[PDB]
């Protein structure tokens, strides 16, 4: 007999995370996935979020797709949801003044969609498949303080370097742009210039800044203005409680989604445990991350769901 949530919840005496705790985009099950194998498009490199590449749909599964970097190895392939704001239709970089990192084999000047499509005999994913007005008060060139998410104990001097639809790219002055990340005005990882001084927290200055540093001086040195204080919005803390159950993508094998439980909570983050598995794979994740979903999301969208790991298996709990 088919595994099911209804059945597992009774066996376990457990509850699911209510749909209302999730963002609409994490919850929505009724949109169709119109992406097909072979369709071509543009997208940010998730491991280098300031860069745009040409991408091909390598696989479709329920409401998700596996994207491949044209010309490059399969080892960089990655997964997104069909409502990803981090992909764009063919032509987007040109119309929005963004730069392209071309497919392997091509110098940048030698790239043109119309020739490439002919050369590869492939179709552009149509524009209507893609979700992606501006974030009030965040403009390119403005400066702010922001948590390095690779080193979360550090709040650092930062600038806005890209604005795309309702989001902006946070960049860390004079550090490599692999540390960049996208967010919106409600992000709890960003703060106005001066926050650290006001809170007593230490501030990480620009890399190799002479004599670590004063904001007023640095704003004058650069002629940049601070993101204004009114622009920052407080996101409410999430309402996920410990033991609530949900579905989460497996970070070790991104293709798979598993039955999951909330192991721990912060204001803005949940720690996920995969039922039946050792606690060694427990991981923190932002409550707004695209790859957590309520119970039912896989069944309703057409994606396989991994049931809890059997008792006495390798890598199992107890």
Swiss-Prot record:
Protein name as catalogued: Lethal(3)malignant brain tumor-like protein 1
What does changing residue 151 to A do? Abolishes binding to monomethylated and dimethylated peptides
Site annotation Positioned at the entrance of MBT 2 and is required for recognition of monomethylated and dimethylated peptides: residues: 151
Part of the full-length chain shown: 272 to 595 of 840
Q: Where is the signal peptide?
A: none
The organism's taxonomic lineage, starting at the top: Eukaryota, Metazoa, Chordata, Craniata, Vertebrata
Source organism: Homo sapiens (Human)
Q: Where is this region: Disordered?
A: 303-318
The entry's free-text remark on domains says:
The MBT repeat 2 specifically recognizes and binds monomethylated and dimethylated proteins. In contrast, it does not bind trimethylated proteins. The MBT repeat 1 does not bind methylated peptides but inserts a proline ring in a Pro-Ser-Ser/Thr sequence context.
Q: Where in the cell is it found?
A: Nucleus
